[PDB]
Amino acid sequence: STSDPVRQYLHEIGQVPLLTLEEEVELARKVEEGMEAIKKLSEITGLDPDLIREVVRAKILGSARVLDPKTVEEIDQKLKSLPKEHKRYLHIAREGEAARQHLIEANLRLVVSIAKKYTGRGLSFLDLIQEGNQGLIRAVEKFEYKRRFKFSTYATWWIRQAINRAIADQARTIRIPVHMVETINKLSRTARQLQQELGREPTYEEIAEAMGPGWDAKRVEETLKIAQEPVSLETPIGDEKDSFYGDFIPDEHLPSPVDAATQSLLSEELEKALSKLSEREAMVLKLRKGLIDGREHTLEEVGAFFGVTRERIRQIENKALRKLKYHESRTRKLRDFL
Amino acid sequence: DVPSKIGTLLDLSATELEQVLYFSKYIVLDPKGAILNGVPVEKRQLLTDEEYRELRYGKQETYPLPPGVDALVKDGEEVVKGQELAPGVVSRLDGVALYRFPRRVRVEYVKEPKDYRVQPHMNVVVPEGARVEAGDKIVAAIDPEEEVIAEAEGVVHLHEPASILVVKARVYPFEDDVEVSTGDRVAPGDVLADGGKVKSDVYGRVEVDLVRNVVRVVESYDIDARMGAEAIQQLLKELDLEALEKELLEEMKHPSRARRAKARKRLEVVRAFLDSGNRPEWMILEAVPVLPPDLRPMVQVDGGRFATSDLNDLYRRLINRNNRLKKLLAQGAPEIIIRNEKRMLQEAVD
DNA sequence: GCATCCGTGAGTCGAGGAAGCACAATTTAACACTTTTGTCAAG
DNA sequence: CTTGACAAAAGTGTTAAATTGTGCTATACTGGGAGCCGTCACGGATGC
């Protein structure tokens, strides 16, 4: 279906026939032989094994794929300049790289069957399939046909692992580490088992006891507080959808008009009070309290500006602070701002 | 947005644009002398997935023979459509016939039709009709205890294929080193092996069979067809708005009112881009802007709970899919997987 | 011309707020110590 | 304005927990699941 992404994907993966026992073994053997051939090529030419595999993969995948192409063509020519005995490993590498593509493409139904069992846990059906496909790609890399086990027995481990790790890493807006995700899942299981056995919702004490050593009611509660998903700001309230959560949440970052005015009123009053001080006493207090440059200066730094020793600055500031205290008492025009 | 601006400039229908944009059909950007069903392939032509596969990789089919039976054809013999390969199976295309998995290998010792049985975990290491000196390997296996070798000199004959592969290709025998490798693409006259003694006589994909020491050229073309917005952006970058306007103006003199009505609609969009100074390819996004965080806040409510906007969830989906596509491209994943990831990335942006 | 399809539009305030483990790698916490800073009394 | 004790007040440097990221399981497993459903206007576009 053009409209349905899932139906379109299923149709595409249904165009590749399933592999028989003989077909699967040859593909796995070719992949295994190619990797061994690539390793030998690196030894013979001294090139990085990763670079050799990337050059081989680029040649197989063709020009329909976007190291620039010229460097690939240069390494390709160098490999092709090897003698026949060494060109044989290059041919094996190309055949193995092609086999890797066909072995992967033939097991795309396996991921879909496994992935359909993980829906409803935070990731969509197509997202589960793509994560599973990544485990399937990893399985082809590590699968060993010498053991005579079928591919699905070993691949099902990687497909499930990739899907589960994807859920632990992408299912929540605020990501919780995988280990903490495991703790949350285990706690939910324990509560569910206790709930079905006590005929009621267990308390944190029961859950902590069932979890095991190192768990108490406080830890059970903190873990449950950790696992709370954020609520949407656009959730409707009421039968008619014209009100939302965001309409009821005040902004408490920006200062209010009343807060801004009292800050500016205080600055004006403090400026007038600092007028009664001497020319240098006002500078000392304004420098030490961060009223000039925005940041507090120290006695030594203040002395550096004025060339006086640290001790003297402390005394002169204290006298000025005493002066201001006397002025405030005789006026009481600055106590309301505190 | 009906009528689409992208479709109007490129002259693509609403359905045609959707098929390309969401990876349902290919659009030809360079035919490369490709012929489809006896007709040359032309630029801007829409190809279905089967047509693209036939053009880009060729025609081939595998027919599974029933167990025990022996095919009526030899390995490497050309067949014609309708010919019976095995006693009960008839091919549907002409090409080289190849044994897939020979179940029994019948060697002929000279002094003697000794036979050996082939198992799925075993592979034959010699071609049909080969003289084997006493000692040479014949059938390989995982365990050397079951490995098959030749006691004396003889001729190796392969029988009882698991299936028959019919491939439309040209087979080029060789003796010395081949100058090409598997997956390479060649054109007529290109050297294949033996210093020009063997050369390609047809387009196709070259694959070297070391067991049969021949070079097969699977007849196919190096056509340039693409899907998605990468193809559309390629067409939108190639547009010459000056040239398009002149052609549209000439068609504005057509007697038919529908033709002039359509030409006016196209030229109104063309005129808009010409006058404003915008580029048509800017309608395809390469970088997606991200809204400032304070306009999509994640705030802590008076109770300590967190509230967030829907845009964060939509951004996370696009970022997750974008990152996954990069990983898949780095892994060299098959085209089917990549197409699904690209189709999901487009939907996430939408 | 012609149906058939899709897309856009349809009053205002108010009140209702499901693996598990192993191990490596990174980060956080707790010491330790030295190095400012702030006072002090003098002087 | 100094001038020397002083004491926290702070910072720098290791170290060890505590937290977090990552790889790995080998019987065989191979194409999803939920709508379902009482309105009426218009353009405007295409199927031709």
CA distance B286 to B301: 37
Q: 């090897």: which residue's tokens? A: A82
Residue B307 to residue A129, Cβ atoms within 8 A: no
Nearest to A66, CA basis, from B231, B57, B235:
B231
Which residues partner with B102 through β-bridges? B161
CA distance B60 to B82: 14
Q: 């449950």: which residue's tokens? A: A224
DSSP code of A236?
Answer: B
Chain B partners of A2 at a C-beta cutoff of 8 Å? 18-19, 22, 24
Contact between B266 and B250 under an 8 Å Cβ cutoff? The reply is: no
Start-to-end Cα distance in chain B = 13
Taking the C1' atom of C15, which residue's CA lies nearest? A238
CA distance B313 to A173: 7
Which architecture does CATH list for B167-220? Beta Barrel (2.40)
Q: How long a stretch of residues is chain A?
A: 338
CA distance B73 to B88: 12
* Tokens linked to A211: 């979890």
Q: How long a stretch of residues is chain B?
A: 350
Dihedral of CA atoms A38, A40, A44, A49 in degrees, nearest 10, equals 40
* Tokens linked to A236: 């409707």
Q: How far is CA A173 from the centre of its chain?
A: 10
User: Does the CA dihedral A216-A219-A224-A227 come out positive or negative?
Assistant: negative
CA distance B59 to B350: 37
Whose C1' is closest to the CA of A243: which nucleotide? C16
Which residues of A participate in the annotated binding site for Mg(2+)?
81, 208, 212, 215, 239, 242, 333, 336
Contact between B129 and B155 under an 8 Å Cβ cutoff? The reply is: yes
* Tokens linked to B261: 């009505």
CA distance B113 to A170: 64
Q: Which residues contact A21 (CB under 8 A, 6 or more apart)?
A: A150, B120
Nearest to B182, CA basis, from A25, A75, A90:
A90
Q: 């075993």: which residue's tokens? A: B122
Residue B179 to residue A22, Cβ atoms within 8 A: no
Task: Please give, one letter per residue, the 3-state secondary structure of B231-273.
Answer: HHHHHHHHCCHHHHHHHHHHHCCCCCHHHHHHHHHHHHHHHHH
User: How many beta-carbon pairs below 8 A join chains A and B?
Assistant: 137
Buried b (16+ CB within 10 A) or exposed e, B152-172: ebbebbbbbbbbbbbbbbbbb
Contact between B192 and B209 under an 8 Å Cβ cutoff? The reply is: no
User: Does the CA dihedral A139-A129-B331-B290 come out positive or negative?
Assistant: negative
Q: How far is the CA of A176 from the C1' of C17 (A)?
A: 28
Question: How many other β-carbons are positioned within 10 Å of the β-carbon of residue A139?
Answer: 24
Q: Which residues contact B148 (CB under 8 A, 6 or more apart)?
A: B105, B116, B122, B137, B138, B139, B140, B141
Dihedral of CA atoms A212, A218, A224, A230 in degrees, nearest 10, equals -160
Nearest to B169, CA basis, from B182, B178, B160:
B182
Q: Which residues contact B114 (CB under 8 A, 6 or more apart)?
A: B106, B107, B108, B151, B154
Backbone angles phi, psi at A282, to 5 degrees: -65, -40
Residue A94 to residue B182, Cβ atoms within 8 A: yes
Radius of gyration, alpha carbons of chain B: 29
Element of type H or E holding A133: helix A125-142
A251: closest CA of chain B, how far (Å):
9
* Tokens linked to B248: 């549209």
CA distance A91 to B215: 12
CA distance A274 to B229: 68
A244 SS3 class: strand
* Angle ∠(A89,A91,A94) on CA atoms, nearest 5: 110
Amino acid letter, B312: N
Strands B122-124 and B191-193: unpaired
Q: Which residues contact B227 (CB under 8 A, 6 or more apart)?
A: B20, B23, B24, B25, B26, B27, B339, B342
Q: How far is the CA of A300 from the C1' of C26 (A)?
A: 40
Cβ within 8 Å of A, B 124-143: 142
Q: Which residues contact B151 (CB under 8 A, 6 or more apart)?
A: B109, B114, B134
Q: How far is the CA of A139 from the C1' of C27 (A)?
A: 33
Which strand D nucleotides have any atom less than 7 A from protein CB atoms? 1-4, 19-22, 24-33, 44-47
Question: How many other β-carbons are positioned within 10 Å of the β-carbon of residue A58?
Answer: 21
Cβ within 8 Å of A, B 228-257: none
CA distance A317 to A281: 7
Which residues partner with B300 through β-bridges? B306
Nearest to B250, CA basis, from B242, B241, B240, B260:
B260
Secondary-structure percent of chain B, ordered helix, strand, coil, rounded to 5: 30, 30, 40
Nearest to B121, CA basis, from B101, B141, B135:
B141
Nearest to A234, CA basis, from B236, B310, B75:
B310
Contact between B279 and B286 under an 8 Å Cβ cutoff? The reply is: no
CA distance A261 to A243: 32
CA distance A128 to A169: 12
Contact between B218 and B60 under an 8 Å Cβ cutoff? The reply is: yes
Q: Which residues contact A38 (CB under 8 A, 6 or more apart)?
A: A49, A52, A53, A56, A89, A93, A96
Cα atoms found within 13 Å of the Cα of residue A228, Cβ hemisphere only: 17
CA distance A287 to A277: 14
Tell me how far CA of residue A120 lies from CA of A128, A167, A231, B20, in angstroms: 10, 10, 18, 31
Contact between B35 and B29 under an 8 Å Cβ cutoff? The reply is: no
Q: 């593509």: which residue's tokens? A: A101
CA distance A21 to B160: 17
CA distance B343 to B321: 10
